[PDB]
Amino acid sequence: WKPDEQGLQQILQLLKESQSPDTTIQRTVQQKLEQLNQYPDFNNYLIFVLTKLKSEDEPTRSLSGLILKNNVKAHFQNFPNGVTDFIKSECLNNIGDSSPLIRATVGILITTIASKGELQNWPDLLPKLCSLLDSEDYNTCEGAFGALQKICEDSAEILDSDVLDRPLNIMIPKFLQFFKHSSPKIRSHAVACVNQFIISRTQALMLHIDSFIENLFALAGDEEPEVRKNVCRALVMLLEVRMDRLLPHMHNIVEYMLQRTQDQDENVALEACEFWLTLAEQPICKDVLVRHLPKLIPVLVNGMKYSDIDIILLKGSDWNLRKCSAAALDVLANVYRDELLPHILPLLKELLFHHEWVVKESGILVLGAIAEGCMQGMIPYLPELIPHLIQCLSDKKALVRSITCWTLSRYAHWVVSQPPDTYLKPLMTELLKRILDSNKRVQEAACSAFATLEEEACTELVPYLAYILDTLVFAFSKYQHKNLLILYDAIGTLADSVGHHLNKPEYIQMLMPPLIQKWNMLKDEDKDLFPLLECLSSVATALQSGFLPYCEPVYQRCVNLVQKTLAQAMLNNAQPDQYEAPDKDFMIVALDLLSGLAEGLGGNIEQLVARSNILTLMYQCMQDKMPEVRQSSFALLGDLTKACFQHVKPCIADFMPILGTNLNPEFISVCNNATWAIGEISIQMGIEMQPYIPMVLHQLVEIINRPNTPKTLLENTAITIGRLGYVCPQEVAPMLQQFIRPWCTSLRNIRDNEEKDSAFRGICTMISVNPSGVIQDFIFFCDAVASWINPKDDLRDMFCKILHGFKNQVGDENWRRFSDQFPLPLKERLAAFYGV
């Protein structure tokens, strides 16, 4: 190319200046580079200094290389080909430079190039790189492998995509030759490469699986950590996708993994420990472990202690041996259930009461970890353990306090189910104290644990509501920011647990001011809104009218957040390369808060909706690609329908066809909320609903006859069908034979409320229009009517009119034989109310 002395001297001068200890020289060197980088020719100088300029020292050559790298990831589109090709050429030609720093710099350049732009645009990178493995010089093959490894890491899928002509059909069968290789580094690269294409079930690998597995075993004997680490994760991945292939060697594999899990090198052990975690997901787990389980449990238990460094760090967090071991134990507990207890109880006895806090803490962890799996088996021990754990809450070691919070929370169901004064009361008391711990980890552990307890206790908290709030409020003034987020969640779940009991002037006055205070601090782009808003949602629903003095600004901000999200999305859709896609969670939380507001206030939200474009915003939300957005919007739709239908009615003709295209059970909660919504709009439409029925009925009937459909979806589907029939018996009653069974099965099990009332009025009207529609399945109807504890008088008369009607249709004889099949409660009930 064209490097001239004057040019070179200037850049070297600038490179020297960038290495100055002087802070001002630095700031002005920054702006000097700022200008130069936009000149493609400058990049030519940069690579030249890296690869060609032998004269220059290593940190100078490499820094030139790195500046170039930054350029290749903010300006690469604007590179002409002539410079690009000069860099590409110059890199691959120096990939094995005897300087490790130069080698690394060249390497980042290659891989960054491939990454940012070269996608398929570098057609002969991979082919040359592969052949560069066959080369003589050690550094050369090492450098090439390093590059390949990195390419596979961020590029993984190069096969599954096929944007280049199936390139992996060449590479994979090429790595395993180097498994055999004399040097540890190369072995690692080779394995680390192959490993990238296991879970993907990569064609090239799957039809080469035997060669892989054989070569892996050949490595089992290797003592080089990096190799062990990679072999370990190979086996883990293989276990998930090629179960068939490793059964015949399973004993030897388990023996190997169990050894490595006990490796003194933390990293080997962690990769080894993943084996147990994924093995526990396979149905063949019990059979495979029989010879090794007795050793595995104590080994897992021992790795669940904090490491020595973590102990030191936590005095003054991501995946590690402790977490993996604890997670593995958790799943194994769910697999073995009560069979695990004889393995674990002798360990617990030595751990739970131990004089060394680290050992004790691990014991408490274990106790918590196994809670879900071994719950039945632990019941006998809880009258002793729970009081003991309660004591541990005031242990003088913070790390003991925090884990106790969690473990106790894992046994919340049992606690709540016992007399309140024996466990619940003292537990709640000590948790509250612990919420105000001076230690921040404890604060959140306690707060998290209390929330869990709240969820389980529900109304059982009502007597202690004042005492609870005292602490939660005080925490507002105590907590820094991170823990205020968990606190909002605890308040949120409290509001859900105690419902309307929360509606007291004193409670509102102590609770609301600090909630709004943080509301005013937070900006519309701060994710920390999510917990606050979700908290507000629950409070609003619980407070109802009590929320009146607070609604307006809350309402405005939410609509606004939805508006700006929709805006940002359109803007991004127009020019993706210039405007960031928005975080739709802001929209989800805002809709969900508007839903709560509407549920809480009911009719009293009218004035706000009157002044609002919320419905025109909803129209786009309902059509969003993201299920949760639709799910939130259908919920708000249902709420506004009940609260102030006059504003909704104009939109129905647009809204219905969309509701009709979202009755897809694949999206349970979207389907559910759409279904609920259409039931509520029915009631408001009356017979005006007739034209919309066909676009919705067939599907609802399909969904209510569908196996493996959640209880709640089926209940809403039944109610809605009931409701459609009430307003338009003529359109729906012909379908009676097809839905009456599951309709009845589903609704006999629900509480007597307005919705059930509404749905049964519908089923009566339909029977009056098509009685031969129920005759064959009348027992179901009988049972469903018998499920009513206190039906309204008119609904009752409808019932006995249908019952009397049926008995008269079949005559005293057929009736008495039909009623023979009545369980006693049923036979008895329809004489207390119905005289049949």
Binding site: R322, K323, C324, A326, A327, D330, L365, G368, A369, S402, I403, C405, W406, E444, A445, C447, S448, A449, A451, T452, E455, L485, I486, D489, G492, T493, D496, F530, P531, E534, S537, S538, D592, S595, E628, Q631, S632, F634, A635, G638, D639, I668, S669, N672, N673, W676, T712, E715, N716, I719, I750, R751, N753, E755, K756
Partner: peptide, 20 residues
């Protein structure tokens, strides 16, 4: 039961402190 499904409770569970 009969009514809308929300993810609020689930979102709170995701944010909750866990030792693993």
């Amino acid at each position: 039961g009969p009514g809308k499904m929300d993810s609020r409770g689930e979102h709170r569970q995701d944010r909750r402190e866990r030792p693993y």
